[PDB]
Design a protein around this ligand. Structure first.
Ligand SMILES: CCCCCCCC/C=C\CCCCCCCC(=O)OC[C@H](CO)OC(=O)CCCCCCCCCCCCCCC
Ligand SMILES: CCCCCCCC/C=C\CCCCCCCC(=O)OC[C@H](CO)OC(=O)CCCCCCCCCCCCCCC
Ligand SMILES: CCCCCCCC/C=C\CCCCCCCC(=O)OC[C@H](CO)OC(=O)CCCCCCCCCCCCCCC
Ligand SMILES: CC(C)CCC[C@@H](C)[C@H]1CC[C@H]2[C@@H]3CC=C4C[C@@H](OC(=O)CCC(=O)O)CC[C@]4(C)[C@H]3CC[C@]12C
Ligand SMILES: CC(C)CCC[C@@H](C)[C@H]1CC[C@H]2[C@@H]3CC=C4C[C@@H](OC(=O)CCC(=O)O)CC[C@]4(C)[C@H]3CC[C@]12C
Ligand SMILES: [Ca+2]
Ligand SMILES: [Ca+2]
Lengths: 686, 430, 686, 47
């Protein structure tokens, strides 16, 4: 049959006269428009405030074509100017001046948009400056979780409006131009705002992308202002400015606090830090790799000497040398390496201690290791004290430091608990499972693993291992997520297999060589207990679990078959499915991570360097034995900021002009321009 | 709040519509319901709230069961809460399964047709309730829809096997109540079968929990993404099967002339049967050396050698050529998947949430067992629709106007205008 | 200090007057240009034919600005017009007409480029047409490898020119528009040219990319013309046209020959083929999934009968039924499937035979298998004969078919031989290693594997499996390359290991259970011989080689360590490195292949469907017992082609006008249009 | 040879730029100014 097509969204149509009037505006025939206006006055045959089906009234049609002359003409006559300012702002015309100067439903702008907000959303420095010149105000956005104010706790009235309204204020407050013009410290505000927007992205799940976009905008602005620095004097004035000692790279620090990674990685910023880092070794960059190597080696070897001189007489030239950051790093790395070497000796016949003396006396090696251990713990204490629990806790590695140190402490305690209560020397085989000595040795070994892995942190220093370290760390996060999925898989099959074979468990005695478990020559009772089941399935991932572990002694074919099927399915899911997926996932992640590795690495390295720049530093072994000024500083900062902001505004314009295609609307204007010129010429010549 | 359109959207798989911020906002409002501050509370407080609600899930359920009007009875209504309460119920059930053997059935190792310990009885209730829930759901929603989503499809088999397990148990307790040594039991003794089925169901039960992942914004996207790729594996499966059987036939043909891969000393018997040949090749897949190279015959050197070549070729084709392909496919697959994960995840989570929005289901499984204006509506809808349409047109107009780039045609048009004007003037001025 | 900068390769400079003259041309001031010319004629103060710093003269400046008024003026004053036509053709403007009408050292065009060649390179249909209207010719490029012509022996001199000149000719002959205007059969011309260009891509190692690009241009052109078909009548006239029976899809066949995959995969083309394929199954695909399965299964089961009917009464309802392509496929597949089932019956040894009888009488199942074998043979024979060796040789699966069949032949031969001789019976153990019966069994097993894996070809008929099969094939090529590298590594380590352990080989008798090799309960003498060393290293790749095999009984520690180290390095190079690299390579290709998966699959599927579309076909078991017409056909083809070309040219133009951005040249043109306009008006008003 | 190669190169680069560079906003602005300037001139002469 046929499908009928009828207009249901009925709409009134413009009179021919009306329609004609509108067409003239689009072509720019001032004359015809003028005539129409005058006639309509006397005759009243056309509402000058009529609208196209597309809602384009005359004033709007004129603003879009940007014919200020026709605009003035229309405005002179009484033409409704509702929301026109907003259109003139969206289009970013400076014919806004005219509308502002004149001053005598189905809107394309939500009821909350005020001229200042729209101008901000457009980021037109000029247009914004005009409006800001007249007193203007943007409402405060109540802080996150400001539910206390019944004002926000009345969102029940209209949530979508509340949320949208909130985004609009921030979309305005986060405009680079408004921050340039209205903020005293454009750099600080962008840092803070960036953070808040980030936090909001989390709280307001919807509009997450929006808030996140805004945050990046703020971060980019701060970097760009920094890039507009043209002398090192300026760079210092900026990075060493304290809002409220000075000369402590304060803003660089705040930037690290707010995770302003890009700002920190900016070339110039890096260069300044480098100079401070390599003080004492000018030209270190030019130094031949071999030469460098040599210098580093010597210093590291003499680390004990430098360490002492400082203690004895910081003022001494030698005392002065260890104070230099790069040195500190080298000295502190050597101390750690020395420590690790000590640990290695402990596993050797260096001291050849007996192995049946329960509660043995600490060996010399152990004695020497003790000081370091004490230094490391003390360092942590200071770190916590000098940085607050927040900073310390935030650091991921502080976690490992804690673990390593805590184990190196339990080791000591257990050692003591064993010196006492165990004066004998019974055969090791007679020692019980939880003999303190055995437990101590275990803890020490575990810590020796953690201690040697802490060296990975040092990689951030090298330009090659650093980026790699960072990328891998990021990918670790992805793997962690996958493990959660896998874990459920493991648990499922673990419970199933245990539930099937738990009946057939056998006493170790019965087993050959009185050994019961997966870690026995003849793997037995691998699924009898849950824990064994989990371990067994874990090992099966590595093909270290034999298949004869699925056969019950009584040889019940059905049960064994169900078991083998279950085990096989687990192996398929884990090894052939999840494993391969993880690989693909990881492949993607690396591609993305690789792109931002540098900013990620440099930020990391800077945090490391900054750690040493600080004054409180000695290696772990020997670790345990004016308003006037402010005003002037602020004035200088404001001076630099003024210049930077100016340079930024200009650069952004140049970029916009040199990198933006001619949209269709642009073409339309040109056509209208010729059209108007034509009419004018035709008339004068006719 | 019928949420009709919202539901039709999910029916018609309108993922974009469901993932549009405006819709997400509406949903969240409903999901957290009165528990809106939940969104504002700090992680710690939220964590605490969740745990608390879950722990007392029976209590809260009871309140609703007794005084649904009570503030507490109201708590279960909030879709978010129901989720927590219902989720806890399942976890308690899984616990019962765990404590079934770890801490029970200790003296019934050799008692055929053992009695029904209370654990068994309790579990029964839960299983029943969960079944009923499926029925009610299947009833209200329909069939195909119910079958479509996995948590349900697993819920069928799981409940099935669980049902069979307890049945056989009853039969056994009657027919065979002997107390002989487990070993002397016949392989297909009812009890053995029940235990096997029960165990498998236990695996299925836990796997079901995967659904909960959708709720999390962190692991939920990944869970969904994985499922997507889980399809492309099917293709590989088909190819592998052909390869498996192809080689299985040959091996059997060359070898058919204590026993099996599953014995301390692997016997060539692996190849004597057909199913065995399949298993044997199956374990080769993993390439972790689950089956030795003892394809040698008891003795037939050539016969043994050819066999080595056959198995070797199988390994090279499957372990190397086919596998690496699988990875390649997965890589390409995820790439695309990674592009729309958000939309997919959102749609999934929404489908999950709506289930709780309904008032039909309120009580967790164990308790669940215990049992014109139109003119105005249309008018308003039309009003709103008119506005949205107008806004759409204007918006599109602007967007195009401000994005669509000029084209040669436009240029040519302009040049024509300059020409026509040029000529006109030239003529008007000789 | 300072680096002085001077113009090293200096060039004559323009006088002030000359500079002004050229400047006027760039502004389009006809008046000043005219005056300058006239004055030069009188005072001879300006070389009308002067040149800009960029080497552009006045006419060239006018051509680029596209000011025909000024061009005419300059030409009337007889300005050097060398190469101007070429510049105009590149600008693609109607100034070409003027220069052609105006008829009678540095150039941006090589000395070989001719007006038509450049027009072709530009692909402007109009300009090409204009030039062709006047006699124009493009030199015919000599056949690939035409040394006989001493003219090709010019390559000895300025090969660079020779090569460029050739590419230029082909770049022209391969212009869609030229092929459209000149060729009688645009489609066939493109098919052929695209192939020749591909061949050249190979022969001319350098310039390969260019030739390949030109080839794709030709291929796409053909598809595009086909896409412009609007009715089935047209599509049939095109695809069934024989250059010179008809109704044999001749052109489609030519396309398949020239590997014109895109053409063969065009949606409309694929639609026609389907109708032919599923003849008798209206909406077979539409038939409910199950329904399809039902019908297929039923037909398959009845394959022998259908086959028998065709054998009995070709001209019968049943006899005709098998002739349908889809039915043939169903039957010919069911036949193969039953063949495989018979081979399976052997596995289960349904018909068991004594293991002692030497050369037993062929078992029951064997006999049954014999016919199919014979049928397959004769089939291949027919193919070879019918298609000729070249084509048969081309098919890769033909190789598998040949191999499968050959194995079946030997199996039979040996079975026979073992019957005449070895007629008696002895304990299998006594049988020599190469007893005929033993060898036959092995060959049979291998053949069975090959036969079953031949089913992969059938995947091309499936929408899901097909694309995968095609992709795999493409990747396999690369895998082979990787294998060569792996082999080399294997050989290297094999030689080395064998070189170290061959001093310590032991006798089988000495070895426990008289077993020697890597396939004994306790692996032994793994690296004793190269043959064994090679095997051991191969199996190591799968982890089936134990590490204890690296120790010599005499226990020479050093040797063993070197041996283990070599084995270990092999493992790392093979598993950790090479294997992983293969993953990366395969991921890269799979990505690419994925881009063109469908076209590949559909081209393959068509080939398959076409095979059955023919008439010579019965299942393998029962396999072995007027110029006027052409004129009309050609006339119709020409009419359709004319229409297709017409609608194609238009489309291309429309696409360009609406799907191309405005480049700087466009701005310059507009700027000139306004400039010249201004000057004229000012003069008139002045 | 270098003289020739440079001439050829420079020319090629210019061609590439002209044919492979889009119209930027600044271009629009120039065009607009050109029309505007012309208008003023004509209006003055004719006025
Ligand atoms: C995420 C979690 C959800 C994923 C869900 C499902 C994934 C599919 C699970 C299929 C597992 C079936 C295999 C179990 C099994 O066969 O037990 C062996 C057991 C061992 O006795 O053997 C058998 O039960 C019967 C012998 C037939 C073995 C052949 C079966 C092949 C099936 C596909 C294998 C795929 C290998 C691909 C390698 C390239
Ligand atoms: C999809 C399905 C289609 C793929 C088709 C073909 C893929 C290529 C098949 C090649 C298999 C040949 C291997 C068979 C075999 O050697 O049997 C061992 C048997 C075991 O006795 O040993 C031998 O027969 C002779 C000893 C030579 C072994 C070295 C051969 C190396 C060939 C390449 C190996 C690639 C390993 C790469 C790992 C990075
Ligand atoms: C393509 C071909 C070119 C590739 C060229 C080179 C690739 C690098 C080759 C390095 C091989 C060295 C390993 C040899 C060996 O260690 O023998 C063991 C032998 C076995 O006795 O053990 C030793 O000789 C000393 C014990 C030290 C073993 C640790 C060495 C670790 C080196 C890296 C291993 C990488 C594993 C990565 C897995 C994720
Ligand atoms: C590979 C095996 C033998 C383990 C070796 C353990 C250590 C001896 C290695 C592992 C990581 C190495 C560190 C990796 C990172 C660096 C950064 C490196 O500095 C640079 O690369 C650039 C110059 C700068 O640090 O400013 C100084 C050496 C150091 C501490 C390396 C010192 C030697 C370390 C501790
Ligand atoms: C998975 C295990 C049990 C191996 C099974 C071996 C065969 C029974 C399978 C393997 C590949 C299958 C073939 C794969 C491809 C097709 C295409 C299929 O056709 C379609 O899918 C679309 C309709 C059309 O062919 O036009 C017809 C069945 C067939 C021959 C299949 C028939 C059954 C085959 C031979
Ligand atoms: Ca620390
Ligand atoms: Ca063939």
């Amino acid at each position: 049959d046929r499908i009928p097509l009828q207009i249901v969204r009925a709409e009134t149509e413009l009179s021919a006269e009306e329609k004609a009037f509108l067409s003239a505006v689009e072509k720019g025939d001032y004359a015809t428009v003028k005539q129409a206006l005058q006639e309509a006055e006397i005759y009243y045959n056309v509402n000058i405030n009529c609208m196209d089906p597309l809602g384009r009234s005359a004033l709007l049609i004129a603003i879009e074509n940007e014919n200020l002359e026709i605009m003035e003409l229309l405005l002179n006559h009484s033409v409704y100017v509702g929301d026109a300012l907003l259109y003139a702002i969206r289009k970013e015309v400076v014919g806004a001046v005219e509308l502002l100067l004149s001053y005598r439903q189905f809107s394309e702008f939500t009821p909350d948009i005020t001229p200042i907000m729209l101008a901000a959303h457009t980021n037109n420095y000029e247009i914004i400056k005009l409006l800001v010149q007249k007193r203007v105000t943007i409402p405060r956005p109540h802080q996150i979780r400001c539910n206390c104010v019944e004002c926000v706790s009345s969102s029940e009235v209209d949530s979508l409006r509340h949320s949208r309204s909130r985004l609009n204020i921030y979309k305005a407050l986060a405009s680079p131009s408004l921050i340039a013009l209205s903020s005293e410290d454009p750099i600080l505000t962008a840092f803070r705002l960036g953070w808040e927007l980030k936090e909001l992205s989390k709280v307001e799940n919807e509009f997450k992308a929006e808030y996140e976009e805004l945050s990046q905008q703020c971060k980019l602005f701060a970097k760009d202002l920094l890039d507009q620095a043209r002398s090192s004097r300026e760079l210092e004035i900026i990075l060493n400015h304290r809002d409220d000692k000075y000369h402590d790279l304060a803003k660089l620090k705040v930037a690290i606090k707010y995770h302003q990674k890009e700002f920190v990685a900016q070339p110039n910023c890096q260069q300044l830090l480098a100079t401070l880092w390599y003080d004492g070794f000018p030209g270190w960059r030019r130094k031949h790799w071999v030469v460098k190597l040599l210098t580093c080696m010597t210093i590291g070897f003499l680390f004990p000497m430098l360490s002492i001189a400082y203690l004895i007489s910081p003022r001494s030239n030698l005392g002065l040398f260890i104070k230099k950051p790069f040195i500190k790093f080298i000295c502190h790395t050597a101390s750690y390496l020395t420590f690790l070497f000590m640990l290695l000796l402990a596993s050797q016949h260096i001291v050849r201690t007996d192995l049946h003396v329960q509660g043995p006396p600490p060996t010399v090696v152990e004695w020497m290791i003790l000081p370091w251990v004490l230094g490391f713990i003390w360092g942590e204490i200071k770190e916590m004290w000098d940085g607050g629990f927040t900073e310390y806790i935030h650091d991921w590695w502080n976690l490992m430091d804690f673990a390593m140190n805590s184990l190196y402490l339990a080791t000591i305690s257990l050692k003591i608990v064993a010196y006492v209560k165990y004066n004998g020397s019974r055969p090791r085989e007679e020692w019980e499972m939880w003999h303190p000595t055995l437990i101590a040795e275990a803890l020490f070994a575990i810590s020796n693993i953690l201690s040697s892995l802490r060296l990975i942190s040092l990689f951030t220093a090298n330009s090659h291992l650093g980026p790699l370290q960072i990328s891998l760390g990021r990918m670790l996060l992805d793997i962690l997520k996958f493990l959660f999925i896998y874990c459920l898989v493991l648990l499922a099959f673990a419970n199933g297999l245990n539930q099937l074979y738990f009946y057939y468990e056998t006493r170790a005695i019965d087993e050959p060589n009185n050994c019961k478990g997966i870690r026995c020559e003849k793997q037995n009772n691998a699924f009898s207990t849950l824990f064994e089941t989990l371990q067994s399935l874990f090992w099966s991932v590595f093909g270290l679990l034999n298949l004869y572990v699925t056969n019950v002694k009584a040889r019940h074919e059905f049960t064994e078959f169900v078991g083998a099927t279950m085990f096989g399915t687990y192996n398929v899911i884990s090894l052939v499915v999840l494993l391969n997926m993880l690989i693909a996932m990881m492949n993607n992640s690396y591609q993305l991570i690789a792109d931002h590795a540098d900013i990620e690495w440099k930020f990391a390295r800077t945090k490391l360097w900054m750690s040493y720049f600080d004054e409180g530093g000695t290696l772990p072994p020997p670790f345990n034995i004016r308003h006037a000024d402010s005003l002037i500083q602020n004035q200088h900062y404001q001076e630099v900021i003024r210049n930077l902001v100016k340079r930024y505004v200009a650069a952004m314009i140049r970029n916009s002009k040199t990198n933006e295609g001619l949209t269709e609307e642009n073409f339309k204007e040109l056509k209208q321009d010729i059209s108007s010129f034509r009419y004018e010429v035709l008339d004068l010549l006719g | 709040m019928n949420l009709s359109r919202l539901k039709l959207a999910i029916k018609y798989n309108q993922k974009e519509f469901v993932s549009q911020s405006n819709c997400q906002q509406f949903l969240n409002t409903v999901w957290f319901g009165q528990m809106s501050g939940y969104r504002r509370k700090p992680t710690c407080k939220k964590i605490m709230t969740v745990l608390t609600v879950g722990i007392f899930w029976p209590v809260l359920s009871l309140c609703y069961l007794i005084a649904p009007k009570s503030q507490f009875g109201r708590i279960i209504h909030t879709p978010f809460m129901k989720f927590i309460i219902h989720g806890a119920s399942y976890f308690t059930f899984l616990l019962l399964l765990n404590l079934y053997s770890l801490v029970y059935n200790e003296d019934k190792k050799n008692t055929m047709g053992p009695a029904l310990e209370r654990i068994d009885y309790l579990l029964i209730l839960w299983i029943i309730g969960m079944i009923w829930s499926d029925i009610k759901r299947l009833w209200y929603e329909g069939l195909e829809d119910f079958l479509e989503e996995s948590r349900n499809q697993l819920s069928f088999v799981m409940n099935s096997l669980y049902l069979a397990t307890f049945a056989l148990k009853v039969v056994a307790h009657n027919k065979f109540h002997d107390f002989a040594d487990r070993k002397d039991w016949d392989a297909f003794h009812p009890t053995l079968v029940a235990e096997g089925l029960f165990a498998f169901a236990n695996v299925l039960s836990y796997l079901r929990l995967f659904f909960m992942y959708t709720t999390s914004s962190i692991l939920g996207p990944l869970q969904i993404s994985m499922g997507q790729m889980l399809q492309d594996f099917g293709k590989f499966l088909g190819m592998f099967l052909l390869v498996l059987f192809s080689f299985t036939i040959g091996l059997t043909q060359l070898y058919d002339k204590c026993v099996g891969i599953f014995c301390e000393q692997q016997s060539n018997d692996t190849f004597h049967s057909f199913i065995g040949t399949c298993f044997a090749l199956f374990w080769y897949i993993f390439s972790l050396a689950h089956v030795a190279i003892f394809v040698t015959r008891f003795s037939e050197e050539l016969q043994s050698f050819v066999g080595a070549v056959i198995v070797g070729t199988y390994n090279v084709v499957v372990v190397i050529v086919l596998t690496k392909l699988l990875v390649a496919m997965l890589h390409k697959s995820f790439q695309l998947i990674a592009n729309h994960e958000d939309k997919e995840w959102k749609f999934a989570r929404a489908k999950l949430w709506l289930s709780y929005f309904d008032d039909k289901c309120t009580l967790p499984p164990p308790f669940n067992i215990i049992p014109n204006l139109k003119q105005k509506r249309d008018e308003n809808y039309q009003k709103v629709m008119c506005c949205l349409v107008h806004r759409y047109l204007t918006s599109m107009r602007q967007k195009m106007q401000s994005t669509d780039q000029a084209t040669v045609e436009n240029l040519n048009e302009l040049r024509q205008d300059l020409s026509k004007f040029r000529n006109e003037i030239r003529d008007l001025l000789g």
